[PDB]
Design a protein around this ligand. Sequence first.
Ligand SMILES: [Ca+2]
Ligand SMILES: [Ca+2]
Ligand SMILES: [Cl-]
Ligand SMILES: [Cl-]
Lengths: 290, 290
Amino acid sequence: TNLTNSNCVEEYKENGKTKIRIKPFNALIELYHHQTPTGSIKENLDKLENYVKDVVKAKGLAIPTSGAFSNTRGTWFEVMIAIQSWNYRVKRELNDYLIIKMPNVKTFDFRKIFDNETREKLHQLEKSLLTHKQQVRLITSNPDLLIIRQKDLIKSEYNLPINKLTHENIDVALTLFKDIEGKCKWDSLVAGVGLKTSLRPDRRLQLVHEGNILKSLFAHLKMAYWNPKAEFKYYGASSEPVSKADDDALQTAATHTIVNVNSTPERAVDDIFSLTSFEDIDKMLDQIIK
Amino acid sequence: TNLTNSNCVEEYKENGKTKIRIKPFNALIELYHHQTPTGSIKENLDKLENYVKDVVKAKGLAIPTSGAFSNTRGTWFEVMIAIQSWNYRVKRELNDYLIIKMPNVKTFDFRKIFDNETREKLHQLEKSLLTHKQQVRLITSNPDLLIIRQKDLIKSEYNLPINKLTHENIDVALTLFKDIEGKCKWDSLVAGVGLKTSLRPDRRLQLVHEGNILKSLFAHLKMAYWNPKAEFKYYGASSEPVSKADDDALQTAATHTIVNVNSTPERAVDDIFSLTSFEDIDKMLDQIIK
DNA sequence: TCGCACCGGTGCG
DNA sequence: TCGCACCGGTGCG
Ligand SMILES: [Ca+2]
Ligand SMILES: [Ca+2]
Ligand SMILES: [Cl-]
Ligand SMILES: [Cl-]
């Protein structure tokens, strides 16, 4: 019952008023410092939410808003996937694959992953797209997970599994991206994944935009290197059931692949996964990689 | 002070519990039955929100959630733009232009606007995109406003201005789409507009997806009819200031226009408007149409 | 200071 | 019954 000394919430000052802030990572640690989560993802998210809700209540404080939990639930789901993806490549012994949880585009633009030769190809494109009366760009939010196949990137440190959630464990999973800055050959990036706790008819179109933009960058790289064999695939994943409507929407073409009558149409999002249990995270990775 | 007899909120039964529901149209009528809104849009939205908030408070009831107001504010902004667009074409005497507020994709798929010859061209595309091992589609939410140039579509009934907000006035603005079912030639549709009370780094990419998909449908129509002169433009509009970041994101290419080194890159969203006052709605329409 | 990216809770047909 | 499309309120660097 010692909820009163929890640190999953945090008081702070704003306009002479004490304000409340959820600490999402702290909530993870306090519930999982002995054992990372198992069973139903959706149920674990609610357990985390009802924990903080009990911490505030016993502390005498105001309930955080629905917006605060949306932000927080998004992080819980991402950290859960990241950690389970870290452990997947260990127990499967995939010594040439990395599954990386990416930060936001300002912290680390995903194009920074690539080597010099490829970063300049992309810069040739970027620069040429601005050299017109009407300036154009190619912008999107960072993919949530990147799957990279490149042997020389794996170090022995990565083969140690994460059995418990600590500030230090979460930090290595969430800074792994740093190790690969500059080192990737263009055709080593093999897939990306967009993660959402839930979908909505509007928010689900964000996955399509993302895949469309990434594949467009990649189609350009296929051309510059004149390599028709290399592929980049993009995927969505939800913590809820995926309806038929969600399915139809996520069948939307990568529009540059439908210009001519003889082109093979390509989907922007190759597939959408409904992650009910942690087991399903393993199942999804099986399809993506193999 | 007679807030107690307002109908902008409405009690209803759910699991033996009386629940509260905002009636957004009713709020509009009760505040604007003598005079449609003028001045600052953003301020009028807050006036509508503080009206309902005062109605519930004086009635003794629970405050509607932040989600309820998001849904409601979205409608207020749309009805305001629609009505002001109705009056724009009247006072400007544009006898060959319609600016139509569109409903959702299930109520009225926007492709229903087109004549038979064009609806079959689109069906040839739709059918061909499914005739592959990997089924693909072209899906998006309905554009908020359509701008259509076709003389034979204007009737004298449309030239009467809307000076006050009544259930009957709002209804004609919101059912105008019905009049044009089947009657549009492909190159009569000249622009679309996506309307948002506010932007966010994720929600703003929805405008890009939309414009990308619409222009892709249109590029196909340009090809089938072999007409290089016809254009379709797509625009965004916010009720808040538009930052530089919002601007950069909305400079994103329509990806099918950047495949070859000699193609002229096209933006998915041709421009983004910050609508501070009702006057700005008139200004935007001036740029779009002329 | 603000930009990024998160997602639930609606009103309505 | 649910699918559509709406958008604010965050935690954090
Ligand atoms: Ca995501
Ligand atoms: Ca809109
Ligand atoms: Cl195991
Ligand atoms: Cl006037």
